[PDB]
Subunit: 84 residues, 6 copies
Amino acid sequence: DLATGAKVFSANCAACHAGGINLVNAEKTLKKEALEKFGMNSIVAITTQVTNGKAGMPAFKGRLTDDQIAAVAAYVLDQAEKGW
Amino acid sequence: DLATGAKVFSANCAACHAGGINLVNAEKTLKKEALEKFGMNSIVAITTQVTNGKAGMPAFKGRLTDDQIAAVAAYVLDQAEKGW
Amino acid sequence: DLATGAKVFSANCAACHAGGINLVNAEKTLKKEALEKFGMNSIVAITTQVTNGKAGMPAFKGRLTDDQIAAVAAYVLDQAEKGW
Amino acid sequence: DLATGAKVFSANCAACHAGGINLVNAEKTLKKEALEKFGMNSIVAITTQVTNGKAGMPAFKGRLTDDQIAAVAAYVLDQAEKGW
Amino acid sequence: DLATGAKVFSANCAACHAGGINLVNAEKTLKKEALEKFGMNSIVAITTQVTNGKAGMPAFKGRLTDDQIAAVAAYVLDQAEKGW
Amino acid sequence: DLATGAKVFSANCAACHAGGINLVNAEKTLKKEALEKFGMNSIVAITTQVTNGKAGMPAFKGRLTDDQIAAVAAYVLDQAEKGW
Ligand code: HEC
Ligand code: HEC
Ligand code: HEC
Ligand code: HEC
Ligand code: HEC
Ligand code: HEC
Ligand SMILES: [Cl-]
Ligand SMILES: [Cl-]
Ligand SMILES: [Cl-]
Ligand SMILES: [Cl-]
Ligand SMILES: [Cl-]
Ligand SMILES: [Cl-]
Ligand SMILES: [Cl-]
Ligand SMILES: [Cl-]
Ligand SMILES: [Cl-]
Ligand SMILES: [Zn+2]
Ligand SMILES: [Zn+2]
Ligand SMILES: [Zn+2]
Ligand SMILES: [Zn+2]
Ligand SMILES: [Zn+2]
Ligand SMILES: [Zn+2]
Ligand SMILES: [Zn+2]
Ligand SMILES: [Zn+2]
Ligand SMILES: [Zn+2]
Ligand SMILES: [Zn+2]
Ligand SMILES: [Zn+2]
Ligand SMILES: [Zn+2]
Ligand SMILES: [Zn+2]
Ligand SMILES: [Zn+2]
Ligand SMILES: [Zn+2]
Ligand SMILES: [Zn+2]
Ligand SMILES: [Zn+2]
Ligand SMILES: [Zn+2]
Ligand SMILES: [Zn+2]
Ligand SMILES: [Zn+2]
Ligand SMILES: [Zn+2]
Ligand SMILES: [Zn+2]
Ligand SMILES: [Zn+2]
């Protein structure tokens, strides 16, 4: 759910995406407008990138359960709307 | 207008000012409060800096039409109020 | 008060915490959610860190009066709620 | 030559690559090892990217002469070798 | 060895430490002087931190083999000595 | 001397200049070439800026003794020469 995404995000994502930014590839933020722009505004899109990684973003298949992954894709999606 | 500023901003400004920050000179953000503080909160101020550049900010006279420049100064001004 | 925190923040804090970020230790932002997470969401917590510093954050005992310190802890607390 | 190279770099490239870094896409530095790793360790490789751009890196076609681009590409390779 | 070290670093560490920097916690670089200053100038020191993680640095236990971690620790020390 | 210089730098300057970088204003690094380019390659130039501050760089007057500032200026010049 939502409170478990907030916890998973704090443990695995905050280093690079603190408060919705992207320290590694600056334009590829977690902001709503950016998520729309790169077509990552979806639970499908996020859950697959988190799984297989992409460029500087690591893969999280192996250490996140696809229940925690679905939940953190959803936390991302919820703060983006609120925005951050 | 507004939708053409969103496009121009994505193509020319997002590298340094992704989501209203400034990666090059940290305090000189595009946030409302910062725009007021440095007296850049105006279409005049923005359109002239974009044209002639300033320190690490390049000049965009030559590659942006002063119709695209006026529009992106306005996109900046619209996200700042909404804020970002 | 509030307008004097805005001035003190601009003079002493904006270099590292421009618009609520943290350029030095990325996750330790001034955002509401981060302030809660690290237990810095309080005038007590902020006023003591500002005074004694902590890791890369300097101490401001000596150059900020504990009237300016109380006020800037409060500016931080006010933009965090508004958020930034 | 490297002196015109050095002047072009200072005026156009140092905002995002100061000292051989990459502020926008952190792994794509101007250090010799990254230039080798991404296949950008040649005049032609560099001249092509500077001319046309790639992602957050601007196109310099029509802003810099071909001689300026050649010179800046040479300067990058030279600085990389010396260790910036 | 340093070649497997170099490949592991590229694939897992360059996102936050490209060129010996630290994007997340700026003072904790991979430069020889910072490694000495924070007591991280040994294989065992580095292997332990890579394995278990610390704050914003991820744990690599179970993601990288012990041999890969050993090799990456060796590569870090070697690059530090050469000056990245 | 450089040992007191090294201790002062670690305690006061590494937050924004770790390894010779400039986290706040990216082009104004402590590398020898940038120090030359901005006319900051002298003890007097550095002691003056450290003492009085400039823009996002804090004033250290009254926080550091004149001897500490002298020593840190010497250390900067020395590290620049060695290549940080
Ligand atoms: C923790 C599990 C997460 C979550 C939920 C996200 N990230 Fe990252 N991220 C990083 C980089 C370099 C990119 C760009 C990759 C590329 O070039 O395409 C991303 C991208 C994303 C997105 C898409 C954003 C967009 O605007 O397109 C999303 C939704 C996302 N991430 C979520 C870098 C890192 C890290 C640095 C080592 C870490 C850790 C994470 N990401 C972890 C996570
Ligand atoms: C695309 C055309 C744009 C737009 C619309 C803006 N920028 Fe930049 N910017 C950069 C730097 C280093 C500064 C500070 C300059 C200085 O020292 O005075 C700025 C400043 C601005 C402002 C004013 C912000 C303020 O708070 O005062 C504005 C409104 C602005 N910019 C808009 C850096 C860069 C880039 C890095 C290479 C790029 C690309 C751009 N800017 C592009 C744009
Ligand atoms: C001006 C007087 C201020 C104010 C009001 C704040 N800061 Fe900083 N800050 C810096 C660093 C490296 C940290 C992390 C320290 C650590 O490792 O614990 C912080 C932390 C904070 C907090 C807590 C944030 C949190 O989410 O826990 C707060 C409320 C805060 N600061 C306010 C770095 C710097 C600087 C770089 C040199 C400067 C200047 C300042 N801080 C100044 C201020
Ligand atoms: C001024 C004329 C220059 C020069 C000589 C170079 N750049 Fe950049 N750069 C930027 C980004 C985001 C990238 C990555 C692009 C991508 O996604 O692939 C680059 C890349 C380079 C390279 C290749 C480096 C590598 O390791 O592969 C080189 C040689 C290079 N650039 C030279 C970002 C920016 C800017 C920010 C807005 C600016 C300004 C420049 N680059 C300008 C220049
Ligand atoms: C890939 C396998 C690696 C390797 C070899 C290293 N890292 Fe990192 N790192 C990160 C952060 C936030 C820190 C500071 C942690 C803290 O608070 O103490 C570190 C620290 C290090 C060190 C010690 C450096 C020092 O000067 O003390 C070393 C040797 C090291 N790391 C090696 C952040 C990140 C990442 C961002 C999400 C990633 C990815 C890595 N580290 C990965 C690696
Ligand atoms: C600790 C005592 C130090 C020392 C020795 C130096 N700094 Fe900084 N610095 C900061 C910023 C924003 C600038 C640019 C200021 C401007 O707009 O002109 C600087 C600049 C310097 C220089 C000149 C470098 C050059 O290439 O011109 C030097 C020698 C220097 N500093 C030394 C930012 C910061 C900080 C962030 C809040 C802190 C802390 C320091 N500086 C501290 C120190
Ligand atoms: Cl440079
Ligand atoms: Cl430099
Ligand atoms: Cl590399
Ligand atoms: Cl690297
Ligand atoms: Cl590199
Ligand atoms: Cl150090
Ligand atoms: Cl340092
Ligand atoms: Cl260092
Ligand atoms: Cl330079
Ligand atoms: Zn947060
Ligand atoms: Zn990018
Ligand atoms: Zn928020
Ligand atoms: Zn955006
Ligand atoms: Zn940032
Ligand atoms: Zn500044
Ligand atoms: Zn937004
Ligand atoms: Zn602000
Ligand atoms: Zn951290
Ligand atoms: Zn705001
Ligand atoms: Zn330089
Ligand atoms: Zn990258
Ligand atoms: Zn020609
Ligand atoms: Zn050098
Ligand atoms: Zn490298
Ligand atoms: Zn630190
Ligand atoms: Zn084994
Ligand atoms: Zn090197
Ligand atoms: Zn150092
Ligand atoms: Zn950096
Ligand atoms: Zn600058
Ligand atoms: Zn004295
Ligand atoms: Zn060194």
